[PDB]
Amino acid sequence: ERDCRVSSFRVKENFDKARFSGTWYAMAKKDPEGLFLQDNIVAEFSVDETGQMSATAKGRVRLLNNWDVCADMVGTFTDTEDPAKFKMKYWGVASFLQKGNDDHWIVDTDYDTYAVQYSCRLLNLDGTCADSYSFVFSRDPNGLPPEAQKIVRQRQEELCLARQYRLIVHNGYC
Ligand SMILES: CC1=C(/C=C/C(C)=C/C=C/C(C)=C/CO)C(C)(C)CCC1
């Protein structure tokens, strides 16, 4: 039935920055092509007097050939007409770690438990994503409540990504 075309994906209606600030732990990930954050991912969202959201993240990264850094990144969110959609310019603090611009959308969150993020880097000629990533976020490093987990799993499904994720560890690494 449902359509996996990016423009169809629903986002978090009336998204609120402030409400969203804080720490978030990465419980599950859907990796994109190439280089990406491995595990122990923690993000920390913030917004300023100007209403511009931002954030720092950190997690193990397995640089080429087993060389495990503990990356520390910085993203800065440029708004869009859609409040749940932003353009995220990121970069690391060291200059060799990866820099980029990524669409960052908030598929759904409840500010206090979970958040589901999605990002489509490259679209297919059919409107579906050719290269995406998704992050399931939890306010508790221990995981989400069965009630929360249930909706999340529903979202993973509407993103045509269910069954593509992978649990993320937080073993102390960073
Ligand atoms: C900015 C940032 C994000 C993206 C971080 C990325 C995409 C890190 C990639 C690191 C690379 C792979 C380092 C290896 O050199 C996430 C979405 C978690 C949320 C907001 C903070």
Curated annotation (Swiss-Prot):
Residue(s) carrying Omega-N-methylarginine: 121
Residue ranges crossing the lipid bilayer per the database entry: none
Compartments reported by the entry: Secreted
Protein task: Retinol-binding protein that mediates retinol transport in blood plasma. Delivers retinol from the liver stores to the peripheral tissues. Transfers the bound all-trans retinol to STRA6, that then facilitates retinol transport across the cell membrane.
Record family assignment: Belongs to the calycin superfamily. Lipocalin family.
Subunit relationships: Interacts with TTR. Interaction with TTR prevents its loss by filtration through the kidney glomeruli. Interacts with STRA6.
UniProt name for this protein: Retinol-binding protein 4
Native source species: Homo sapiens (Human)
Gene: RBP4
